[PDB]
Design a protein around this ligand. Structure first.
Ligand SMILES: CCC[C@@H](C)C1(CC)C(=O)NC(=O)NC1=O
Ligand SMILES: CCC[C@@H](C)C1(CC)C(=O)NC(=O)NC1=O
Lengths: 168, 168, 168, 168
């Protein structure tokens, strides 16, 4: 590539893997969202919370794809594995799965940052710090807050309704 | 009729029967609405929900009557049978009866559509599709959502109050 | 399902397959878009054209998912197969692949419509007609127009630049 | 210096060298710009593109000078070597020289960042990341895009005119 400079093949490959992780996270949130839209689940606040996250993850993937091209790397796409569940249980179950998902995305970001630092690639490191690392920390804090409130509310039916009505 | 074209006597008669069904549904919702306005029931959100449906059903009947005349059919009215109950029990009971009512209206629409298709009457089929079929599907989805939330809330008194306050 | 009415298992399954097709089409357009954003391809108008289609296909999938739930069907997601190519060649090559993709989506819509008609499911038939069938016809006409103009422009480098600058 | 803290003599000297590189880049772009303003070259879009870059590089030098003073380092200026060419050939030739220039500035930034990291100087590292590193990556991507389009357009006279008219 005419523009490629200080951009290792290792980082390029890792960025492609991170794109896959973000697209798969987006897919997972799409499924979560429409599950809460079921007539026999019917928690619109929860549906909206996850649909919004689906959009955020898709946007993250696209930001990574843009950066790949900016650096002269080449996007390679793989199959997107279907989400791990077809039915997501309670808001509590769903929020727990969401935090597990985000911690896995965060660890991937941290791993990529460590790789970038090993490869002496400050642009990559800065890119991750300004657009992904703090966003993950904030989102995980928020999910933790939600989990704590959901748990304190478990008359579980009553609690699940109130949380959706008054928090989401 | 000078204007009548491709409008079968079967469809004309069926449209008159559907008008009766819609007027009777409207009457049912009128009764539901004022029941929840009783000082010993006192659920204003529920009253409003049903009063609004009474207006929607009356409007549906009038749209059918307009179409009857547009096609050169002749409106024939029959007695409107009084609603099936004088007292409607809980919000849960009432919402269950409402969904039963709407499924019966929907089936009547589907039957009329099948008749129109058998009579090769595309105007009728289109009329039902654009003004009634999707509205029924949407309303039934909403009622199902409400039923699910009411059920999850059953401290039944507390649940009935919260649903009326926070959903309706 | 409490709300499900006149919604066959065949249609429910077919709607799930159509969701997969739309998500995969979206994925294909994502890849097409970022390919034209490569520094060694550099056709921004073409990139934007495909990115916009990626969004349209994702939106189509979500509309189908909403309808699935409205009817009381259950969303089931499968793996999303990666796009058929990693590199998309010329604008001409890409536009040809796009029209092949859209014709395949259109045929799937037509097949689902035929199924709905066989199952006497007028809501499904109307849903497809008002939100998908005409949109496909319009998009395919536009792609055909583009293909014709690209072909008339093939000094192929010059033609590809002018088309991107003056049409897209 | 009363304010100097964690600011190595090595970094101070390197920052002075980077100032020289940026001022020289600015000078190079000044020459490029006025070359395309010649009556026998006459490509106003190209002239403007380079004049704007001259201003950007001068602004970069001044930002570095400000930071030098903020940290308590002392600005030292050296002779500015004249640009490497008096006449810049085609837009293609000029854009190639511009990308060579920017890669050399980028490498200097990367070298300074590595030095800052070795000296454990996080303020320097952050300063470079937020104001220079991403700007270089973006500019180099843009130049690569331009080069690709210019090359696809080479009727070379025709191509050079069209690129200036429709891109710049
Ligand atoms: C918001 C959900 C994202 C979905 C639609 C998904 C992958 C499934 C995505 O993340 N990005 C796309 O460009 N297309 C898609 O289909
Ligand atoms: C925009 C061109 C910059 C020129 C004018 C140059 C060095 C030649 C500069 O970069 N900064 C200045 O302060 N003066 C100058 O003359």
């Amino acid at each position: 590539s005419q523009i490629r400079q200080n951009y290792s093949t290792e980082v390029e490959a890792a960025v492609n893997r991170l794109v896959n992780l973000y697209l798969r996270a987006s897919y997972t949130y799409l499924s979560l969202g429409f599950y809460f839209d079921r007539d026999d689940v019917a928690l619109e606040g929860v549906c909206h919370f996850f649909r919004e996250l689906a959009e955020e993850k898709r946007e993250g993937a696209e930001r990574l794809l843009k950066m790949q091209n900016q650096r002269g790397g080449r996007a390679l796409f793989q199959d997107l594995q279907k989400p791990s569940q077809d039915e997501w249980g309670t808001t509590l179950d769903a929020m727990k799965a969401a935090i597990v998902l985000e911690k896995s995305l965060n660890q991937a970001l941290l791993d990529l940052h460590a790789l970038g630092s090993a490869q002496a690639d400050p642009h990559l490191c800065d890119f991750l710090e300004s657009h992904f690392l703090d966003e993950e920390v904030k989102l995980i804090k928020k999910m933790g807050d939600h989990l704590t409130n959901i748990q304190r509310l478990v008359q579980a039916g009553l609690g699940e309704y109130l949380f959706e009505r008054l928090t989401l």
